C-alpha cells in the first residue's frame, strides 16, 4: 500500500471501504474484532441501495432481515435495539431508506471504533511509519 492511499483512510471511512487494499486490510482487521458480519451486511445493504424498485426490496429484505436482523440469526449484527425494530416495521413498507439507517449505524460504529483502532492498529502504523 502506498503512503498516499493510507492517508485517505485518515480522511474518510468511504475511502477505506472504497480502496482495494483498504477492503483487504479492513476485512482482515474486522476478523480481529470478529466484526466480519459488518462487512457482509454492508455488501447486502449496498445492493439494497442500488435497487430503486420497492417491489424487489421485500423479497431480499425478509432474507436479510431474517438472516442479519433476526434475534435468532447465527450472526447478529451490532445495532441499536431501535434500529432493528425500525427495520422490522419497514418490512410492511419497504423503502430505499429502510436499511439506510442501519448502514449509517455500521458506518458510525466502525468509524467510532475501527478508525480509532485502525490509526492505532499495527497494520496502519507499519504501512504508515
UniProtKB/Swiss-Prot annotation:
Give the function comment from the record.
Answer: Inhibits signal transduction by increasing the GTPase activity of G protein alpha subunits thereby driving them into their inactive GDP-bound form. Activity on G(z)-alpha is inhibited by phosphorylation of the G-protein. Activity on G(z)-alpha and G(i)-alpha-1 is inhibited by palmitoylation of the G-protein.
> What is the originating organism of this protein?
Rattus norvegicus
A Gene Ontology cellular component where this protein is annotated is: nucleus
Q: Where, if anywhere, are coiled coils annotated? A: none
Query: Where is the chain membrane-spanning?
Result: none
Q: Which GO terms describe its molecular function?
A: G-protein alpha-subunit binding; GTPase activator activity; protein kinase binding
Signal sequence interval, chain numbering: none
The entry's keywords: Lipoprotein, Palmitate, Phosphoprotein, Signal transduction inhibitor
Q: How is it modified after translation?
A: Phosphorylated by cyclic GMP-dependent protein kinase.
Question: Which parts of the sequence belong to the RGS domain?
Answer: 12-128
Instruction: Please tell me whether the keyword Ribosomal protein is annotated for this protein.
Output: no
Q: Name one GO biological process term.
A: negative regulation of G protein-coupled receptor signaling pathway
Q: What protein name applies here? A: Regulator of G-protein signaling 4
Amino acid at each position: 500500500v502506498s503512503q498516499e492511499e493510507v492517508k485517505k483512510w485518515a480522511e474518510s471511512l468511504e475511502n477505506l471501504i472504497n480502496h482495494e487494499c483498504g477492503l483487504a486490510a479492513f476485512k482482515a482487521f474486522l476478523k480481529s474484532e470478529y466484526s466480519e458480519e459488518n462487512i457482509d451486511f454492508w455488501i447486502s445493504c449496498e445492493e439494497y441501495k442500488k435497487i430503486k424498485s420497492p417491489s424487489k426490496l421485500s423479497p431480499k429484505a425478509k432474507k436479510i432481515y431474517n438472516e442479519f436482523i433476526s434475534v435468532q440469526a447465527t450472526k447478529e449484527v451490532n445495532l441499536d435495539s431501535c434500529t432493528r425494530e425500525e427495520t422490522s416495521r419497514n418490512m410492511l413498507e419497504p423503502t430505499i431508506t429502510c436499511f439506510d439507517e442501519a448502514q449509517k449505524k455500521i458506518f458510525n460504529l466502525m468509524e467510532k471504533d475501527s478508525y480509532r483502532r485502525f490509526l492505532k492498529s499495527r497494520f496502519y502504523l507499519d504501512l504508515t511509519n
